[PDB]
């Protein structure tokens, strides 16, 4: 009941630096625990650089839940956000 629908989203459509950092950290932590990747990695072994390549062409399966101070939240797809 606290989910704002997609049509009435009022927050900014741009990805903040904190969202980028948290997304990269989460994806690197997932890759470090043997999660599948959706990019053609060219011999990369560090999870962080694989996550950077994944964010480079928007191939990451996560959404950002932006919580307004009242309590309502706002779901934004990472591929939808502009970076």
């Amino acid at each position: 009941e606290k989910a704002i629908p997609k049509d009435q989203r009022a927050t900014t459509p741009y990805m903040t630096k904190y969202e980028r950092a948290r997304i990269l950290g989460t994806r690197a932590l997932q890759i470090s625990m043997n999660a599948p990747v959706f990019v053609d990695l060219e011999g990369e072994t560090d999870p962080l650089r694989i996550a950077m390549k994944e964010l480079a062409e928007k191939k990451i399966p996560l959404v950002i839940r932006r919580y307004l101070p009242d309590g309502s939240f706002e779901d934004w797809s990472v591929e939808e956000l502009i970076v």
Binding site: T12, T16, K17, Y18
Partner: peptide, 11 residues
């Protein structure tokens, strides 16, 4: 102008 706005979550 749009990139000069204060990003949410900033301390």
């Amino acid at each position: 102008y749009r990139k000069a706005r204060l990003e949410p979550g900033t301390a």
